Symmetry: C3
Subunit: 533 residues, 3 copies
Amino acid sequence: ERMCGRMSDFCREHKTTLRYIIWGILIAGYLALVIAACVMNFHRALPLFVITVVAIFFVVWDHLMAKYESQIARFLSPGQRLLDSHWFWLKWVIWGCLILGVILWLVFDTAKLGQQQLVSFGGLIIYTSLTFLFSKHPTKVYWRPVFWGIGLQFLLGLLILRTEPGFMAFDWLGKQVQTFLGYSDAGASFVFGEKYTDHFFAFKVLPIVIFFSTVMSMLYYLGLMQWIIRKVGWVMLVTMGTSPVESVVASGNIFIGQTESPLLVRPYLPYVTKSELHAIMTAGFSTIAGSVLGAYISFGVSSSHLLTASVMSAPAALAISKLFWPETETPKINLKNAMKMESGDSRNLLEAATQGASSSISLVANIAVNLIAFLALLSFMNSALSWLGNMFDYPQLSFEVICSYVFMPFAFMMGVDWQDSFMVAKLIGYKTFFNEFVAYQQLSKLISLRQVGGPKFVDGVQQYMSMRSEAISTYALCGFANFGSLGIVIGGLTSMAPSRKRDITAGAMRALIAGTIACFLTACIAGMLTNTP
Amino acid sequence: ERMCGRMSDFCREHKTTLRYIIWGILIAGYLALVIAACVMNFHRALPLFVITVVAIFFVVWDHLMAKYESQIARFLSPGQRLLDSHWFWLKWVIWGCLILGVILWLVFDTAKLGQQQLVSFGGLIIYTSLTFLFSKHPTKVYWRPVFWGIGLQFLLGLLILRTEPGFMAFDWLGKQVQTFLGYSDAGASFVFGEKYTDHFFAFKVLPIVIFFSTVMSMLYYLGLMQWIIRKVGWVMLVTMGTSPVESVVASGNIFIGQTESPLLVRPYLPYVTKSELHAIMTAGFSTIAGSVLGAYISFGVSSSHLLTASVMSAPAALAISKLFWPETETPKINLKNAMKMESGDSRNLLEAATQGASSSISLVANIAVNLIAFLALLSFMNSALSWLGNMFDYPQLSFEVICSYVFMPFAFMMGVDWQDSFMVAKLIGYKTFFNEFVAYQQLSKLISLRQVGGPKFVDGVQQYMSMRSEAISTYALCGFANFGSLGIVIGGLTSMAPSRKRDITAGAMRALIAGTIACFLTACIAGMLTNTP
Amino acid sequence: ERMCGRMSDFCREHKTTLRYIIWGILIAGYLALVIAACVMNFHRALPLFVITVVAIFFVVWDHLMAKYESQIARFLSPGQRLLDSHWFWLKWVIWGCLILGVILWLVFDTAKLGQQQLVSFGGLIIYTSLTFLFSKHPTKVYWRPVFWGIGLQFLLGLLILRTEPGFMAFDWLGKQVQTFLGYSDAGASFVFGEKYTDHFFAFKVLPIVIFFSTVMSMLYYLGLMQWIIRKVGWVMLVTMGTSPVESVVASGNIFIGQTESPLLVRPYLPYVTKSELHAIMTAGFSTIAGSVLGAYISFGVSSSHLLTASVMSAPAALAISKLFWPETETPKINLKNAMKMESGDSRNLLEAATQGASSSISLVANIAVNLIAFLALLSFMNSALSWLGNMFDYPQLSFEVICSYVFMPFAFMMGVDWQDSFMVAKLIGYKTFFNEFVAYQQLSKLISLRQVGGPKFVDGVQQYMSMRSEAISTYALCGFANFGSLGIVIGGLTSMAPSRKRDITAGAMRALIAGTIACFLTACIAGMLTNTP
Ligand SMILES: CC(C)C(=O)OC[C@H]1O[C@@H](n2ccc(NO)nc2=O)[C@H](O)[C@@H]1O
Ligand SMILES: CC(C)C(=O)OC[C@H]1O[C@@H](n2ccc(NO)nc2=O)[C@H](O)[C@@H]1O
Ligand SMILES: CC(C)C(=O)OC[C@H]1O[C@@H](n2ccc(NO)nc2=O)[C@H](O)[C@@H]1O
């Protein structure tokens, strides 16, 4: 007993020192492994070396910003005062310079590119103007978020699309995500057998959502997801001027789904304002999750365009939300509380994986059931429309024919040419009424037909559409905003915050419209920047 | 801002006028479409014209009954007083005339038809007498519901079975339902692949319940289901004399399942009397849903007989419930409250479809699991009975052999001939212990063997049975009254009304017996009316 | 009415007499059937005769112990006092005799058997010593439970393994269980079609858990499971000295799963001590359910070893729990309350079957989802470890290679030879991180390779391992203690007893370690007793 007591006292004495010592030993071992790999053959060890270097750089940066925050603020203070003193006369100068730059760039670039590239800018203007017209509180609007959101979208798109180094990186990332989620498909062979490919959607696609949920929960436990969310949220906060909680939600939605994204700020959902809840729902509707990215890239959809659309949507979502539901009340929640995200309560990583996996049981079931019902309804609708049309000697009437004409103006304003606007409109209808998975499937079919080659028109029916129309379609359809999905968002948000049940329902419908408009804005910028093939 | 205010004021001024104007414009457009279709080719446009005419007639009738209700009641009042004044002497005359008519019809018709047609009437009498013997409160019974229920059953059966125009309509309706639910099977190919037919029950049959639930929820939101329920309930109320809530539940169960039917009067379930709750459960047990109708017609079961059985069961259910659990306490719930059914809280049709689809997730899982367990138990029972029989040199002993002898008297009383009574008894055993899906499958096999032709007896075993026995079996087995299903009804009703948890359990067992007896009564009437082939 | 009243009075008079009369008539009929079967052909009727004789013997024994309990206690009292008076000097004599017997048996038997048979005893000592070292309260420990647990394990193993009559019985029981659960596989063909074998795990294996749950619920309703649990618990109680509730839980876990076993003492879970809750969790982790037994026997795993391991684990679980978390507080719960187990609330057997079947819906879904996620994670881990290894010119690095070296000492201490210890270590790693189903699959592959014959080493890789190593592996891996499974146990126990939510989490981790150590102890005894092939 005495020896055990002495050992316990020794352990108590060295607790912090011992933990630091063991962590340092582990880090030194990792560095030794890296250096050995570099010694033997640097070329093979290049990825590991790059990862280590970037990790060290980020850790050093974080530590310095933490410790030296006061000194940096002291250095920055005089410039802020000098700017404030001269801001009155300088604001007009800055605004004029920005307008002149916009005019010069638009004229030269787009005028040389063609007419269709300019109709996209016209559509950008039209969408923003219409959203201003039908705003909930038109009189009280803050324009800084809107302008900064559009500007950030333009800059990100310009870098990624007009620079070869920028274009290559997102392709690489898309391939990595595809492989990582393809690890899931192999793992699901065990449960459903090697004949799981017989039932593709049930036994191949849905298990990818289970694997993605597990991985996301593990990363949440470790504390990485939070880091990236904080960085992007700080960028948006320091430029757009939005509130903290909505920024954190928006940055998270780049990779997290709509159902799970509010869990980041769950503890403060009871106290959020109506505008912030509308922003949350709009961000949820305007962006897709990482799980679907691999499947959509597999269909044939471009990795670069999908990732760029997902990144660009969140600033667009916040801007459109502010222009479609401006805030009229003070925000209670603080920056420190919002940025802080409680880690998973699971004791160990494997418990976090188990809990993340179990949660996915509801989602997959709901998805499968909704798909069954809605596709059966589509079949009934087509048969009845054909029956009605036969009376008027037009047996070809269908959902697609109606939706081609109904949604054509939106496609034309986005910069799609007149002939292909109808084809894009059919896909938009599929995305709105049914989910975007079906729409991406149809788009993949059209892309494959273009790649195979052959007659553009077999008969007076067009078979495939141009590449730029496909890019604009990729941007436009990159969302979770479908009417069938309105119920699940409401139910989840009500579950997380029962007190706010009424506010969630009141603003739910406007959020879907805002998300669609945000996707359209991303598409318009893409059309402005992509050249005519 | 001023222009927006002026527009808002103008919108406020014209609200009702504007809504009426737009609705009128839409109706005028529909009428123009109909008239154009009739102009071009009337023969093709015949269905649309008929639908429009009947809809207009019903709307006019409803409006007139609403506005002119007081005048019609004033016109009707004197006749009621005149009847009441002379009722004392006239009641004996009416009863004697009815008895004489019954005697004359029975003698002529059934005596010419044969002995078996008359044993069915004998069985009708026997079942009613036995239910009177073992009633919960034999002394206090109201005979008007029982007599009116039997009479309405007889009239509906006579019209549908003995009139060619009546017979054709239900066949048409069954075909329509089959097609509408076959739209579901096509829609479920997407989720489970084109190889979904490999697993028929899991991937073909169960999805039909999901599609049916979605459609029923949408129609509930629109307000049609309620209209039909109200009409049939009013008929039963004005003739049988039952209470409002039980009548509404009974009329709804013609097409709605047992689990979902109480949701029509959910708000008042806490306050219903014990007799009314017994009536609710009995109606649930004695009738089948619309989802199963398409499958059962597909197996080979007659559409006309299935629909006629479903329609006839509800009056039989109410009559048998009143004779098996007569009411001893005053009914609190009013006619207006009961007839009124709250529409779905879903904001839009698509939300209603989503909510209806999500609810079906539990039901399909419970059904599949119960089927697995109970069929495995049947396999074990057969193997052990064969093992026991081998000791006594009878290795053929099985569940079917025991159930053929046990249930034979019920089949004989229903009017089935002696030879086929055992075959019907096997099916009744399958229906009672396991669900009626298996029983309908066996019945379909026997029907197919009859249709193919061949030896009636391959050896001293009969292979197929006569057509009339099949009709009586179709009527007898048309129910959801199985012992495995007792749990789900109790759980659902307890969920809807937690306060009444004890009353639900106390009367649950008697309800199953009452439902079986009601199915037997429908079968007896069918046997009385169907001629010997 | 008067006749009904007279009949009711007559029924009231004879209630108990009538029930006894009918039960006696049924029993007499059963005896008549048995005697007829014996008359015709005794040899065929032998199983029925044996079952009847044993049932009669047990009923007579139970009745006599009930009625004559006081007389038996009176007879036993003097001997207890005489033993207590002389216990002071006799305890040393008894302990010395036991030690001398242990020494003599160990020397003769194991020394003749070989070195490996003795390293197993050494490992037994090592595991017990280590558990004593790292105990929660090392100072306060009761050694009687530990010593009695080890002794009972040794006696059961000796009987079952070293006696031919003992060995044959468990093989017979395993075959019976396999057949009874194979009844399930046939019954599940209906729901998933005859092509259900295409997806083996989803459509063949998981349905066996549904059938097992249904059967267990029915037996719980009837009152058999409880009888066996009480008998085994009384044995453990009268020898080990443990508390009642933990003994009841431990005896139940021989055949009941971890998720469902606490339901036996659910009503008193709010009041159990921390030590008893740790014992419950340890018993849950150290034993497998009956559902998996048929599958594992089908793979090729020996029936006798599996059943012996399951039986031996529970005393080991209790002993290791007492040595790893000794009790420091008084136990409130009484023997009578704990032994009594409330029967199912279901009114009839079929309701119990339905309720048992419905409960399984959650378990199968959780199992399937966890398997998908964890196997996908294994695939990712292997690919990344291979990628890292390629840098150091060792592309074969994998999870298996690391786990072979990490877990080798445990396998060596269990008595496995040096060459096969690595192969066993791989299986132990599979069991710990992933569930034991995968590990048993790999073990079945190795057994099949041994049985086919061929090169022991195709190259410098060993292909199959010796029979004794397979037996030790069968004992070692016979558990539900996997890290993925930690979450489900916590969630279920928290659901049953919400008040104790914190105590459940605090002691959850130690329980898994204790369960693994208990499995290792069973393996060590098996290695000590099994001879070298
Ligand atoms: C299986 C996938 C590819 C699919 O078919 O998606 C259809 C609908 O499922 C919703 N969804 C999906 C994933 C998610 N997190 O991973 N959250 C969601 O809400 C979302 O509305 C979408 O449209
Ligand atoms: C899939 C269908 C054809 C089936 O196999 O039915 C078996 C059992 O499922 C119950 N059931 C079914 C549908 C329903 N609403 O659509 N409510 C119910 O309660 C009912 O007891 C029946 O016997
Ligand atoms: C389908 C079976 C063979 C399987 O693959 O099992 C994997 C994991 O499922 C857990 N499990 C299983 C059954 C049960 N009662 O029958 N209770 C449980 O907890 C347990 O942890 C095991 O490791």
